[PDB]
Amino acid sequence: MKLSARNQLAGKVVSIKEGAVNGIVVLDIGGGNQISSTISMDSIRELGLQVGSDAYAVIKATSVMIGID
Amino acid sequence: MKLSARNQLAGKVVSIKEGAVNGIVVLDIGGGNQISSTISMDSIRELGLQVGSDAYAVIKATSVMIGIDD
Amino acid sequence: MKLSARNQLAGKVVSIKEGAVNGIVVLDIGGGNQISSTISMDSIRELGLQVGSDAYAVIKATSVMIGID
Amino acid sequence: MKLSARNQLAGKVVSIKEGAVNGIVVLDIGGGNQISSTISMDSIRELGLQVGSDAYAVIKATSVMIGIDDW
Amino acid sequence: MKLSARNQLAGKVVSIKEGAVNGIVVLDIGGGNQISSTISMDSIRELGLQVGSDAYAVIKATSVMIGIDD
Amino acid sequence: MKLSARNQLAGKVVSIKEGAVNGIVVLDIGGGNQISSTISMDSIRELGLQVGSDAYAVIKATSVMIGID
């Protein structure tokens, strides 16, 4: 599928924290940056994610805030 | 403040699209990646954002989905 | 791409209201249900959406509340 | 209460997966579609939800993305 | 309707900024605190919101971040 | 950091329910209102949250719905 979400950042899975109904996936997206994603365990299983998998961090623009020092 | 949001990514403002009550800020966070943020125009003014400003893209972990190739 | 979002509902575009930076797309997903989506105008153009387009309403499970009478 | 959320879709609870502080509720909203919801266990209990309960999937318009096949 | 959203804060409408497809509603919830809401212009009209209207700010718990000083 | 989030509500922590990857923090912001926040356990620990902590409820404007009687 092609998605409206303005942010679709390729990266490699660095870690997966398995929980009860959710888990947290950490992706290395390059440039020294990592992104953490809290999603359903069903989705982690259905996408076959494991440490080392290639994936994307997907974020709708209305979910992104801006901060300054 | 220090925020619980797991994602706080430093970058430089590449463009700002001004709208009616919202605008869209694009940040270059390095590594060839950019992040687009849709926030209120009031916040854009109050934070003093301009093209070239140093800023952060801040994203709660529960807002991030994972994708894989087809 | 394939997405973790638990909700990916097929439907056809019934209307698009254009704004300044955002627009509102209404999708008929059948069975008398319609979904309204508020997204960037850039995405609306990039996905080539028009009245009648086939599309999907995509919703992260953590964005769905449950209500009762 | 009347809510601003543009999406308020009636359906029946088909399943509830209990987690630690959250659970996942699945609603059959008709037309062969289901909606899955991740909400607090406290709310699942307070709303008295069970398999067979009548409910609504409530989604703010700004939370809905659009996808296409792109073929 | 009854909603699972764990946050439902009564207040009075102090201001409405109209936009193109969205507007921004500000509620006085008391104690010197205000809540700003970015919602569709359709909802603002359909709910009959005006300066002075009694209303509620409704927020899903997964939408709330926690911050601290320093 | 300074954040674009239009809602930054001072309060004191009255409860913490720990989960597997998330926990739920309840902040009393005065006037008889309490705000519940579902965030990662990592964040709860990293912010040093305990009953009695001074903190802020931070909410993006696009996450706030309006309801009426």
Automatic annotation (TrEMBL), chains A, C, F:
Keyword Metal-binding: no
Biological processes annotated in GO: molybdate ion transport
Pfam families, per database record: TOBE
Gene3D superfamilies per the UniProt record, alphabetical: 2.40.50.100
UniProt keywords, alphabetically: Molybdenum
Domain of life: Bacteria
tRNA processing among keywords: no
Ranges for domain Mop: 2-68
The protein, known as: Molybdenum-pterin-binding protein
Source organism of the structure: Eubacterium limosum
TrEMBL record, chain D:
GO biological process, one term: molybdate ion transport
Residues covered by the Mop domain: 2-68
Pfam family, one: TOBE
SUPFAM superfamilies: MOP-like
InterPro entries reported in the protein's UniProt record: Mo/tungstate-bd_C_term_dom, Mop_domain, Transp-assoc_OB_typ1
Keywords for the protein's UniProt record, in alphabetical order: Molybdenum
The name this protein goes by in its record: Molybdenum-pterin-binding protein
Lineage: Bacteria, Bacillati, Bacillota, Clostridia, Eubacteriales
